[PDB]
């Protein structure tokens, strides 16, 4: 009836990579496709360099792929998959953000089963599962390597469309703080905003339970404490490992209760004027909660406390205001921008942006449905 | 170097035995070996009858095992392997409490390594894992369908040695709370109370992290509310959910940080009076984590907090006392008895079974090792 779909495995601290290609190699695998960006391929901090080796001196193979593209494209998924047809994959090793682990969840499913994006889009419609997949990430935001989802982009009438199916799953998560130094100061601000969100947005939905709402919370105790400190010390370890717990315990929770409208509204604008996927989402997120309060303030005010806001004068309501004081402060001291406007929008495309809300799946899960109404005047809100 | 172990699928609420039959369909299994004890096998409520039909309704085969027996022995593992041998398994369901999973595992691992338990004792010393392993629980205390632990006894000198391998770990969980109205009473207050020592002996563990920590406290906060409920109208399953609920909220922490003392000085009370191991628990808890205070009382006032002790007038120290003084008053609210005279232990016998604590993997984890001495003074404050 409410099921709870985690990663099997999830390495964690530093070593965590290193420990992952002993596992990788106690799994008994041999020449995996890695998928990565750009600036990782080309870089060499934790690099694909010091992976690949790393892979290597476990007793294992290796082939890349650099091409991956922000907002996954249906054709990286096509080209590095065949990229790989030439080596004979069996096991897959994501390195990087969001944007790689999807892909790498793209080739993987269509790697098994009829190879279809589309035909895959829906919920739980494969049969077989991705052949096995080990996301190494390196952003402290999204959840992706051990998420469910893997939204594949495609340019016909520029569609995003979803495969949201269980059998995406990755069998190993890791995370190891010191990929994730990498993050600089915009970086760290944008995807350390994007756990958050992903983490009050279940902690109000629709279908939370106990387990979701119990780290979600802590998720955003973390962020509270842990992020503005990574976002000037980007250096600072200790606060890069806390922040990478958080976005995890985040994952987890948001994962198996969805998201409200926070996400629905700033998938849109991500690409539809190709704006970050997590400053877009911290700009919106205190309007979209600000609506929310009437259905269901009385979390909020948990919201609130995980804040840190002494909330034991306030009352229900009130006190969910605080906390979307508080919210909205926390992303003008890591330097999200205040309005929407600067971002560069505008009010003429807010009538068709908007109807695209009624069309993400994740919006279903919003505490609180609204018409077309109040959701333009939320993004108007918004300015 | 911190590792988070779960399963990789949990099912829970009401369907989801019916709705994991389904996913042992869509996983493509034939023909799996139930594992389960007398009493289920005999009964008929949710019985093993209910499933088995079940089983076969989404197109899959079937063939039980009845004589599972309490602190599973190397015998019973080689009895139900064995069983299945003539059907040639490819699945194994086990059905019942958490004697019943441990089985199931040993079975499990022998089914694909080299048959021999104590060369598979230790830590993760298999190479091959587990046949899919999918664990039906019928207990509101134990965490086995989720845990990486099997623990198989073996009489030659009578030991208790410890399978603590990561591919033990259960393909799926399902958690129907309907599976657990079979609980009378009794059991209800045995089980429920060894989840909550589960619980608060991985928050002050050594090796508790962030998630840990999370997932114990809403774990106690659930049992609190629920714990009761349960024991007096059994029937009500509203608080036969949320008690089921935090039985794995508590695996999941008591997994991935282990238990203190408590668990390690009631295991040999269990196998050498053969009392309960939830009673044993309950009756030894609050003297085991009065005898921790020194260490870190500070973690106590968040048990306290999570129990509903109003605690913003007392001071580290003092706070980590009442919730000392809730946890005895709660096992004395759901009938375990107060004091281990009256499970019936000697004075006599006290010194042997502490040496034992020593020998108990699970002691490491306690946040204040103690002397040869303290740990006995420990057994006679427990009188
Ligand atoms: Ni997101
Ligand atoms: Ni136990």
Not at 125 to 141: M, Q, S
Not at 346 to 353: A, I, R, T, V
Request: charged share 20%; hydrophobic share 40%; aromatic share 6%.
């Amino acid at each position: 009836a409410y099921d709870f779909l985690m990663p099997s495995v999830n390495f964690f601290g530093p070593g965590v990579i290193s420990k992952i290609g002993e596992r990788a190699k106690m799994l008994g695998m041999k020449k995996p496709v890695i998928v990565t960006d750009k600036f990782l391929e080309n870089l060499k901090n934790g690099a694909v360099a010091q992976t690949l080796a790393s892979l290597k001196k476990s007793g294992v193979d290796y082939v890349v792929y650099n091409g991956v593209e922000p907002n996954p494209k249906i054709h990286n998924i096509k080209e590095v998959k065949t990229l790989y047809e030439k080596e004979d994959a069996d096991s897959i090793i994501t390195v990087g953000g969001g944007s790689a682990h999807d892909t790498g969840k793209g080739a993987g499913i269509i790697m098994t089963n009829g190879d279809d994006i589309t035909k895959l889009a829906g919920i739980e419609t494969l049969k077989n599962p991705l052949p096995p997949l080990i996301a190494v990430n390196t952003t402290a935001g999204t959840g992706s390597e051990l998420t469910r989802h893997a939204v594949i982009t495609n340019e016909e009438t520029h569609l995003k469309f979803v495969v949201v199916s269980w059998r995406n799953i990755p069998l190993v998560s890791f995370n190891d703080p010191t990929l994730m130094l990498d993050i600089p100061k915009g970086l760290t601000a944008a995807t350390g905003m994007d756990a958050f969100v992903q983490a009050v947005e279940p902690y109000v939905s629709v279908d939370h339970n106990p387990i979701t709402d119990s780290q979600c919370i802590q998720a955003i105790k973390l962020i509270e404490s842990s992020l503005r400190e990574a976002v000037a010390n980007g250096h600072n370890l200790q606060a890069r490992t806390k922040m990478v717990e958080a976005e995890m315990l985040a994952g987890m929770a948001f994962n198996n209760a969805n998201l409200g409208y926070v996400h629905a509204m700033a998938h849109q604008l991500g690409g539809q004027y190709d704006a970050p996927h997590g400053v877009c989402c911290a700009l919106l997120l205190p309007y979209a909660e600000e609506y929310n309060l009437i259905a269901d303030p009385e979390r909020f005010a948990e919201l609130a406390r995980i804040m840190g806001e002494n909330t034991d004068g306030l009352s229900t309501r009130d006190a969910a205001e605080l906390s979307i004081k508080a919210m909205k402060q926390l992303s003008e001291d890591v330097g999200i921008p205040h309005s929407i406007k600067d971002i560069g929008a505008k009010p003429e495309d807010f009538d068709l942006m908007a109807e695209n809300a009624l069309k993400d799946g994740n919006a279903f899960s919003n505490p609180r449905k609204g018409t077309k109404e109040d959701i333009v005047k939320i993004f108007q809100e918004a300015y």
